[PDB]
């Protein structure tokens, strides 16, 4: 019962697009980066954004993903 | 006498009220017996899962498929 809503997924896609070089496969360092580079009143929302951002990084390792465009 | 059977897979909850489980059970018999590795479909009441063990009062009846 842990689906990521469109708010979280859209924010994670934006984060991956803008800050690809500062992310890795680690949830915790990505969480620190995301707390630095985003504004949100919700700590839990930022945590979910970090989780899906790490998922997106892991996928981007194994080929391109839909909705992410990088140079 | 009761034979011991090993549940090797849960085929799903049967019945209208969902209180019965249809399972595939292998008859745990000694090697060289006719019922060695013999498998049979049985209806089971109570909480059960894979690798549980049953006491078959009869081994000749198979449960109708669902």
């Amino acid at each position: 019962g842990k689906i990521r809503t469109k708010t979280v997924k859209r924010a994670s896609r934006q984060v991956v697009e803008k800050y690809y070089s500062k992310l890795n496969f680690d949830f915790y360092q990505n969480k620190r980066v995301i707390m630095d580079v985003t504004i949100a009143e919700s700590k839990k929302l930022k945590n979910k954004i970090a989780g899906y951002t790490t998922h997106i990084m892991k996928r981007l390792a194994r080929g391109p993903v839909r909705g992410i465009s990088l140079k | 006498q009761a034979q011991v059977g090993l549940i090797i897979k849960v085929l799903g909850r049967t019945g209208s009220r969902g209180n019965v489980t249809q399972v595939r059970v292998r008859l745990m018999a000694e090697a060289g017996s006719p019922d060695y590795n013999r498998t049979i479909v049985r209806n089971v009441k109570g909480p059960c899962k894979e690798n549980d063990m049953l006491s078959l009062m009869e081994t000749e009846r198979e449960a109708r498929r669902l």
Binding site: - | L54, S55, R61
Partner: protein, 182 residues
């Protein structure tokens, strides 16, 4: 300097095992000093199979409105019951309890007309405990005999498969009806 626990500091858990092979993984024989272990045994479906069997017996004595939650009272009743069982049988009362739980439930039942089904080992253990406690409770309702005496009589009879046991009578009737509904 650390020693294996014995129930009520006198009943040894060493060699405690059930003869019923199909119930081997659903009767817990872990050593414990008292039945009381405030654990969350109902969080997952089969987690109650790891609860020590004497504590499961103690939980069965807490049933009516007057008995809901009296777990220390149940532990004391079981302390006296085990002594009475040992005097009756001259066996390890833990082994007698395990054997009674092994023999106290039908292996085949009937469900909705009716078809004969088989009983899961978890339900066999649950039903054995439930029926022995029910028979002991109802036997002591308006009776000179105390609750520990009735519980000891019921457990000893169920351990031997005697028809004098309430649980054995119910199990035999259920199994006979289920053989009729094959």
């Amino acid at each position: 300097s650390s020693k294996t626990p014995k129930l009520f500091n006198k009943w040894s858990f060493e060699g405690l095992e059930t003869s019923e092979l199909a119930l081997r993984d659903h009767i817990s024989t872990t050593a414990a000093y008292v039945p009381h272990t405030s654990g969350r045994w109902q969080k997952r479906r089969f987690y109650k199979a790891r609860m020590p069997i004497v504590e499961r017996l103690a939980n069965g004595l807490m049933f009516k409105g007057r008995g809901n939650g009296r777990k220390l009272q149940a532990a004391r009743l079981l302390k006296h019951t085990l002594e009475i069982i040992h005097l009756l049988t001259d066996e390890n009362p833990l082994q007698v309890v395990v054997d009674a739980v092994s023999k106290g439930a039908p292996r085949e039942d009937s469900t909705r007309r009716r078809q004969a089904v088989d009983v899961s080992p978890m339900r066999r253990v649950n039903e054995a405990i439930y029926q022995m406690c029910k028979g002991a409770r109802e036997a002591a309702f308006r009776n000179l005999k105390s609750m520990p005496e009735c519980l000891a009589d019921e457990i000893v009879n169920a351990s031997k498969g005697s028809s004098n046991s309430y649980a054995i009578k119910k199990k035999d009737e259920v199994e006979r009806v289920a053989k009729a509904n094959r």
